Write a protein that binds this DNA or RNA. Sequence first.
RNA 1: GUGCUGCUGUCUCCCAGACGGGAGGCAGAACUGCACCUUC
DNA 2: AAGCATATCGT
DNA 3: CGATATG
Length: 612
Amino acid sequence: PSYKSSRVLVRDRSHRVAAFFMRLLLAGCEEPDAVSDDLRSFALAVAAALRLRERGVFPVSVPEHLDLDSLKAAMASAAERKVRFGLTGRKFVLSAAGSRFLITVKLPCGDVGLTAVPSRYFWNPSVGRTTSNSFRIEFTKENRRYVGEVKEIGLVRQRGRYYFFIDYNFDPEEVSDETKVGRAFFRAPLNESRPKPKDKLTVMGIDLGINPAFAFAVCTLGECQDGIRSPVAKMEDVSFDSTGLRGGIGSQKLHREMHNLSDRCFYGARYIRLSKKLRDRGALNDIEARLLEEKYIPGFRIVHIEDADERRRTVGRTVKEIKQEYKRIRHQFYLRYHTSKRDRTELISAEYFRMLFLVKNLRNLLKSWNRYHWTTGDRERRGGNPDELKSYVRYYNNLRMDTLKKLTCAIVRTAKEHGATLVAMENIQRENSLLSLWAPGMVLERVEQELKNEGILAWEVDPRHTSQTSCITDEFGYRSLVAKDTFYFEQDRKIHRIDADVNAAINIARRFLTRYRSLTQLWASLLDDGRYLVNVTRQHERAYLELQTGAPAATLNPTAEASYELVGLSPREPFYRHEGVWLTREKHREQVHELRNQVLALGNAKIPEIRT
RNA sequence: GUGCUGCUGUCUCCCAGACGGGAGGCAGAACUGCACCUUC
DNA sequence: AAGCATATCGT
DNA sequence: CGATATG
């Protein structure tokens, strides 16, 4: 089934027995060795229970007379490893009054009426018992009234606080068979044959980043009015009507301050390492002394003192200033939700990632300064500090999780608003990137799971040359390095520019809808006589060679203008397509550099910008 | 409920030691904001 | 590894 | 509808 969980708090033996159950399953048994094999089989199974009682060793003495139910419940809990209360453990009666729950555990001694602290997850809940041994909860996590079914409850104790896990089933939104057939059609290579969707679906091309948290483009099959036209496999062209950029920088000053402080904390650790070398060794190597003066001093924004005694004092003053600036930045980041800026605060912004990078850099700087004392041979000790920078780590993990949840919610919202039912995302599996903050697959897994729960199917497209190829001419352009938000291409021999993220979003959507009709790069090797044999590993390359040459293999034969061509063969060096001539690696880079030189002389003022 | 997520006063513990940093406990002031399958 | 179903006897 | 017992 599909499950969702949240906790409620109840304020005013089951563990004594849960711990006993865990230990018993792992480890009255007067001669445990003599019955070791059976015990092991039963514990591993958690029919065995029936066999154990026949042996006459299965009855035991529970820490606290749990009679039955509670007993079996805790047993199953330890197994799975939550003192559970089932309705088919001791039965419970979950009701709701006002804005809070009321759990009534039916213990053998009597009824235990427990009121729960009003949660903002199960806000304003309504509970009605069903005929299927369940409770139908209706709550508010807008005023969307989420619905769930509760059949089992669990009790735990954290820091002397008792918590109830309301693990409830829910029904994901209905997904049409047209969406499934359309995904099957569009995901398949051109070699295979799949039925057409035969419906007017909606496709959302998505590019993921950190500064533009994500950008999207929307297309509707069989509906082309105005926008960047894209071919569709075996159908008519479609126009990307809604193209947008979500996320982004909230306030420029805050982003700049986080970047500056992250750089300062990045260089501080290396500066104190070099100062520790200077205080101990007394001299530096040629590279380090050049590195310290040229890079570390202007980076840490410190004044280099020759005296080693007051060098530590200057370093401590600098670290105090760094911490004061960090506290100011954190307070300004907190105030986005507690001023008149409540309305203009975005769901997700570029500061959610800059703050994480700053937290990591400051953690490193503080961990380095705290160990400024150590000298030759101190190293690390089994003990020392058992909770060093615990608050920092807690904040980093909590902010990471919250950023992931808010990004997933933003993506899902944007997909639902635009009516999309198919979402082509970029396969980020294939610093200043989403990686080094999360696992490459974790973000994708979360996003597709939430989209599926909302009834939207998602597919990962190969993200190769999407940010370097124009979405109109389907040719290589210039991605500006001074400003990474402008992508320069040529059209009718006139240089145009576009947003470099909606460009990649449209390229992702185009690759999805055209079923990878065109490839911008081919891997080949030189056999002899200037003939570059094409290396075919992916099925997409096999389909591409069939459509252009006519055979599942081909070679690059040279021409006069340092270019190549596809021929085809009857039965490892990159090559970039360019204008149908398959320029080699060096010539492709030369062409890109020529484009960059041409666009730098022209000036962006005379370069028109297309709709975005 | 869990976080985003902090401020002020005061107190305790630790590492340098006399420039500073890291765990936490209470008491207050402001805020009605966003998101959340937890659990192992 | 987890976060229940049916089935009939007896009263 | 309660008491087990097993899909």
